[PDB]
């Protein structure tokens, strides 16, 4: 299928409690493979998936130096942002950035990403052209002018079209037995009486990878989107994910309801019913 | 590999 | 500023079978800011040495964490997750229910 590398940067100021924590985590699709945390006793880029451990010391030293430098960079950026919004040195604030690349089944660049947010609100984003910016407000326009003067978009374009894709392809090969393996959901329907008048039918998808899935109920072949309770896809802790969808049905009408499942690991889409 | 950003916000 | 209160799900890694060791998960998501306090409870008391995932975030910038610990479900033992966040005036307790 298609694949992505993405890095997720979070920096959080905490006045009176030291300097802002910086954490970077790296993902290929739904699999975390590295972390860096300035609050670790000995901050270092560390492996978080088995396939990355074979990288040599040069990889770990170089990514650690980048993160130690980004740490100071994001701390100075937080000071600048506080000024751009006329905020007090009193409060805590958050700077988030995500960047990386998507490739298709042929390993070819689909698109690149570089987006930032301040206090949970979108702040500035590299456009899909990897050459121009979208700023959310007059503060982000200051950043945009600064990044235009320093040719940041050109640096990002070179990284995203080169380094990023080259390393994503490398990771996909080194971890092909997991990263390029789709695990299908194990599916079943349970029945939970509510009253004499109705019961819950719950359609389960367990143990699947990656997290992308479609899970719906139909009544007489008509989608029940508005009447379905659909929990967020949730991690099991063994790399796989879980999800369920539930509908409330009148007693005796259970056979009018069908659960439909689509996922990359399935030979074909599934249709399930309550089997009493 | 990560990218190194040296220009501040 | 604008803040977001956490979603909470409590569930097992594997299908619950009484007397069989398993893992108890508490998944908190959708929250901002990132500071959050999460406890796993066994019969109302705090389980020690709970582990958790590295802080990351979703496309909408909201944070998510997975807290987890080994546990052996039984018919009588009650399990739960207790969450506190700046958006909450009181800690939120969500009981583990093997049907969800």
TrEMBL record, chain A:
Instruction: Indicate how the chain sits in the lipid bilayer.
Output: Single-pass membrane protein
Spell out the GO cellular component terms annotated for this protein, sorted alphabetically and separated by semicolons.
early endosome membrane; ER to Golgi transport vesicle membrane; Golgi membrane; lumenal side of endoplasmic reticulum membrane; MHC class I protein complex; phagocytic vesicle membrane; recycling endosome membrane
Entry's Gene Ontology BP terms: antigen processing and presentation of peptide antigen via MHC class I
Instruction: Identify the residues that the record assigns to the Ig-like domain, covering every copy.
Output: 185-271
**Keywords, alphabetical:** Disulfide bond, Glycoprotein, Immunity, Membrane, MHC I, Signal, Transmembrane, Transmembrane helix
**Main localization of the protein described in the UniProt heading:** membrane
- Family per record: Belongs to the MHC class I family.
Q: What's this protein's name?
A: MHC class I antigen
Q: What is the covered span of the full protein?
A: 25 to 300 of 348
């Amino acid at each position: 299928g298609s694949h992505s590398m993405r890095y997720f940067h979070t920096s959080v100021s905490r006045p009176g409690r030291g300097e802002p924590r910086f954490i970077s985590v790296g993902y290929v699709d739904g699999t975390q493979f590295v972390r860096f945390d300035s609050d670790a006793a000995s901050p270092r880029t560390e492996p978080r998936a088995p396939w990355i451990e074979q990288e040599g010391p040069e990889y770990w030293d170089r990514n650690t130096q980048i993160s130690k430098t980004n740490t100071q960079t994001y701390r100075e950026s937080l000071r600048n942002l506080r000024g751009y919004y006329n905020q007090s040195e009193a409060g805590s604030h958050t700077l988030q950035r995500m960047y990386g690349c998507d490739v298709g089944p042929d390993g070819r660049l689909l698109r690149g990403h570089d987006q930032s947010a301040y206090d949970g609100k979108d702040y500035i984003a590299l456009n899909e052209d990897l050459s121009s910016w979208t700023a959310a407000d007059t503060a982000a326009q200051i950043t945009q002018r600064k990044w235009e003067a320093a040719r940041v978009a050109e640096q990002l374009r070179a990284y995203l079209e080169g380094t990023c894709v080259e390393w994503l392809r490398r990771h996909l090969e080194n971890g092909k037995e997991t990263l390029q393996r789709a695990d299908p959901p194990k599916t079943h329907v349970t029945h939970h009486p509510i009253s004499d008048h109705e019961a819950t039918l719950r359609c389960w998808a367990l143990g699947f990878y990656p997290a992308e899935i479609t899970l719906t109920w139909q009544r007489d072949g008509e989608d029940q989107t508005q009447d379905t309770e659909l929990v967020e896809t949730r991690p099991a802790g063994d790399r796989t994910f879980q999800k369920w969808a539930a509908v409330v049905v009148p007693s005796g009408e259970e056979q009018r309801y069908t659960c439909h499942v689509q996922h990359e690991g399935l030979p074909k889409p599934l249709t399930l019913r309550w089997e009493p | 590999e990560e990218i190194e950003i040296t220009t501040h916000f | 500023m604008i803040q977001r209160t956490p979603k909470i799900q409590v569930y097992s890694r594997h299908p619950a079978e009484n007397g069989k060791s398993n893992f108890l998960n508490c998944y908190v998501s959708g929250f901002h800011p990132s500071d959050i306090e999460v406890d796993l409870l066994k019969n109302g008391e705090r389980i020690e040495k709970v582990e958790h995932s590295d802080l990351s975030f979703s496309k909408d910038w909201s944070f998510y964490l997975l807290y987890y610990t080994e546990f052996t479900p039984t018919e009588k033992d009650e399990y739960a997750c207790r969450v506190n966040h700046v958006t909450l005036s009181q800690p939120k307790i969500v009981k583990w229910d093997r049907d969800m």
